[PDB]
Amino acid sequence: GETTDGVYRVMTRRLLGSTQVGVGVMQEGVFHTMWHVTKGAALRSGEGRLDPYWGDVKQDLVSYCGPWKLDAAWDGLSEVQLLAVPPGERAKNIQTLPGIFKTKDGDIGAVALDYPAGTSGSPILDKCGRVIGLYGNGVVIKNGSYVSAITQGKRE
Amino acid sequence: DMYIERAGDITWEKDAEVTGNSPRLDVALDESGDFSLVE
Ligand SMILES: O=C1CC[C@@H](NC(=O)c2cscn2)CN1
Numbered sequence: 001g002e003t004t005d006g007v008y009r010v011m012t013r014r015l016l017g018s019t020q021v022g023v024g025v026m027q028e029g030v031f032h033t034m035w036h037v038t039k040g041a042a043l044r045s046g047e048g049r050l051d052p053y054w055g056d057v058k059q060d061l062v063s064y065c066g067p068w069k070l071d072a073a074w075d076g077l078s079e080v081q082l083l084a085v086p087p088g089e090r091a092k093n094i095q096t097l098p099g100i101f102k103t104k105d106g107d108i109g110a111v112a113l114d115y116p117a118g119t120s121g122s123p124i125l126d127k128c129g130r131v132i133g134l135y136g137n138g139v140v141i142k143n144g145s146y147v148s149a150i151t152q153g154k155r156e
Numbered sequence: 157d158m159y160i161e162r163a164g165d166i167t168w169e170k171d172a173e174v175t176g177n178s179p180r181l182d183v184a185l186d187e188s189g190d191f192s193l194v195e
Pocket residue numbers: 114115116117118119120121135136137140144145146
């Protein structure tokens with residue numbers, strides 16, 4: 001199948017028509033997405049098959065064909081871009097200054113941008129174009145708005 | 157059967173639309189991977 005680096009839509013034909021359930025990143029021969037997008041199921045890329053390699057429900061991440069490759073981190077000061085890939089719409093970069101999720105185990109960057117659920121897995125980038133995390137796991141705040149964590153895995 | 161379709165290159169766009177605020181929130185993360193507001 002297609003193994004070229006880049007952002008991909010994650011589609012299903014089980015429901016009505018062809019529905020976009022999420023998004024992911026192909027880097028160094030590995031496909032990276034959020035666990036809630038695929039639930040760990042196998043993926044198809046043309047005539048080829050992508051099998052899960054690593055996954056974790058608590059981190060809400062999963063990699064296919066190999067170990068997690070993305071290790072860039074938000075520097076805690078600079079603006080970033082969400083490369084949003086919404087269902088039925090073209091890829092579009094949105095620039096923002098991330099906020100912060102403060103937890104009992106440390107602070108995590110967060111992006112306050114609202115997209116349909118099928119946009120989960122879109123990458124968040126730094127100014128060098130490095131993927132610092134994926135968009136799509138977060139919280140609904142006091143005004144009905146959506147705030148996603150900047151979710152990053154660990155490169156072993 | 158889920159399938160993937162290429163949607164683009166991963167590159168920073170100079171002069172992209174700039175939006176969104178930067179809220180600082182107290183949150184908890186449970187074993188199911190769900191975030192929640194701590195208040
Ligand atoms: O990528 C994303 C953006 C939208 C988000 N949707 C919600 O779960 C939700 C429930 S109430 C408001 N948003 C899911 N993940």
